[PDB]
Amino acid sequence: NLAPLPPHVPEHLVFDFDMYNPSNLSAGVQEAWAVLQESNVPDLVWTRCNGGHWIATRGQLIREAYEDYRHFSSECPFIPREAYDFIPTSMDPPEQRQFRALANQVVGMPVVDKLENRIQELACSLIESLRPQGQCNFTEDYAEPFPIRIFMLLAGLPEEDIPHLKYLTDQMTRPDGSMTFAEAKEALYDYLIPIIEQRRQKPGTDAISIVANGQVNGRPITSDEAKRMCGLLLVGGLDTVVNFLSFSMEFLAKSPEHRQELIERPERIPAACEELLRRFSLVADGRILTSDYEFHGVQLKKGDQILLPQMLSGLDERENAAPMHVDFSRQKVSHTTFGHGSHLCLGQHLARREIIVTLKEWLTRIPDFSIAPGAQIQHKSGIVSGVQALPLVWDPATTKAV
Ligand code: HEM
């Protein structure tokens, strides 16, 4: 199912990469995407998969396109072109600036600094519950429960609401069929709306209270705007963190030498986090052309979609030498893992703290662990690439109890 080549697209630029099922997937998802950076592949290519779209394959072009919001609009940020209404995903500057500022009040650095110890306590509780078992599926047993619990903390929501909320967010990205995306989204709004209304009347210092009482265009934020922002604050931090933590733990389970480095020098963990963010980058979003535009010698047409994979910038050998090698001592770790330009991840500070806290606590309590005997780790590819499951094993006698 290749879409017919639009007549403005020259055949020599055609490379039929399928972002949802890349051909090299069993070799690892980052490796599968990195085929776009082989020397026979232009900086900018067209694929006929998934409706047909451009792909920028190099960090220079990926960065430039994210900077040039006048040409590359977020109005349609996903491939393929086909109910999504979260804020401020689909907004271009200048509409976007006010909403970002508000979201920044609830997940910005000062909030992350205040929450850090709570995040650690949560990580500790999860790890301690798994420690004596000598095994887990890390993706399911630690990664999945962790970010949703951090959201409940950030948003001041009771833990009793977790199973239902997690179900709704799971339906938006991995539907079992019980709910369409639109139904899942509306159920999420059914949940958030009463809470937003109550906290407009009786505010706390939690994220929902702050969003609900925010100001837009010199007037109060509307309930519709508030639910759409809260929805994004919820979903934006789930699959990205789950899968990223899984890539990192897979690598650490498989590379005892890198693991030992962090055991011996825990102070290097924040730098290691940055290098892992580069090597195991996982997002691939896009933009839509606002007008006909010649970009690096290539004629783009108004309405063309362009995939601008955040994942690829840091894997580009032009940005980082020997880019598939993990080296926690890199003097310059170049990446766009959290994006670039006006939509740069608002959760980047929270995410890094989640990653660093997880690694610190896991290496403290369970320093020696491996991939389960016999297991082969499977990746998945898409807008957020990921790990299907991560069976880990360890000897409880080598662990340190709480
Ligand atoms: C490893 C973890 C994460 C990664 C790799 C990541 C990646 C990204 C990227 C690449 C973007 C820009 C998308 C684009 O330009 O189309 C983005 C935006 C965003 N992220 Fe994250 N994210 C992570 C964690 C989080 C967390 C923990 C939160 C919230 C608690 C969050 C909330 C958001 C929001 C609200 C936006 C939209 C910003 C805007 O449009 O102005 N993210 N994220």
DSSP letters, 93-149, are TTHHHHHHHHHHHHHSHHHHHHHHHHHHHHHHHHHHHHGGGTEEEHIIIIITHHHHH
Q: Please give the Cα distance from 320 to 5 (Å, whole number).
A: 34
What pairing do the DSSP bridges indicate for beta strands 370-371 and 386-387?
Answer: unpaired
Query: Residue 19 Cα, ligand 1 centroid: separation in angstroms?
Result: 19
From which experimental method does this structure derive?
A: X-ray
Question: Is 96 within 8 Å of 90 (Cβ atoms)?
Answer: no
What are the Cα distances from residue 194, in Å, to 21, 101, 187, 299, 308?
40, 24, 12, 49, 37
Q: Please give the Cα distance from 313 to 241 (Å, whole number).
A: 19
Q: Which atom of ligand 1 is nearest to the CA of 245?
A: 1
**Taking the alpha carbons of 332, 334, 339, 342 in that order, is the dihedral positive or negative?**
positive
Tokens 């929450």 — which residue?
115
Does the annotation place 345 within a ligand binding site?
yes
Answer whether CATH 3.30.70.1350 is correct for domain 1-402.
no
Q: Which atom of ligand 1 is nearest to the CA of 310?
A: 10
Q: Please give the Cα distance from 283 to 77 (Å, whole number).
A: 12
Question: Is 72 within 8 Å of 308 (Cβ atoms)?
Answer: yes
SS3 209: helix
Query: Residue 227 Cα, ligand 1 centroid: separation in angstroms?
Result: 17
Nearest CA residue ID for atom 19, ligand 1 = 345
Backbone dihedral angles phi then psi of residue 265, each to the nearest 5 degrees: -125, 75
Site residues for ligand 1, CB cut-off 6 Å: 77, 88-89, 96, 100, 103, 107, 232-233, 236-237, 240-241, 244, 283, 285, 310, 337-339, 343, 345-347, 350-351
**Taking the alpha carbons of 198, 215, 346, 362 in that order, is the dihedral positive or negative?**
negative
Among all residues, which ones are annotated catalytic? 174, 239-240, 345-347
Question: Is 223 within 8 Å of 87 (Cβ atoms)?
Answer: no
Nearest CA residue ID for atom 18, ligand 1 = 345
Q: Please give the Cα distance from 290 to 69 (Å, whole number).
A: 9
Question: Is 382 within 8 Å of 20 (Cβ atoms)?
Answer: yes
Q: Please give the Cα distance from 240 to 147 (Å, whole number).
A: 9
- Resolution, given in Å to one decimal, reads 1.7
Our mutation pick for probing the ligand 1 site, out of 169, 240, 349, counting the most ligand atoms within 8 A of Cβ, is 240
Query: Residue 99 Cα, ligand 1 centroid: separation in angstroms?
Result: 14
Chain CA centroid to CA 11, Å: 33
E strands present in 319-396:
370-371, 379-380, 386-387, 391-393
Q: Any residues with CB less than 8 A from the CB of 52 and at least 6 apart, and which?
A: 2, 3, 4, 5, 6, 46, 305
Nearest CA residue ID for atom 31, ligand 1 = 347
Q: Please give the Cα distance from 155 to 290 (Å, whole number).
A: 36
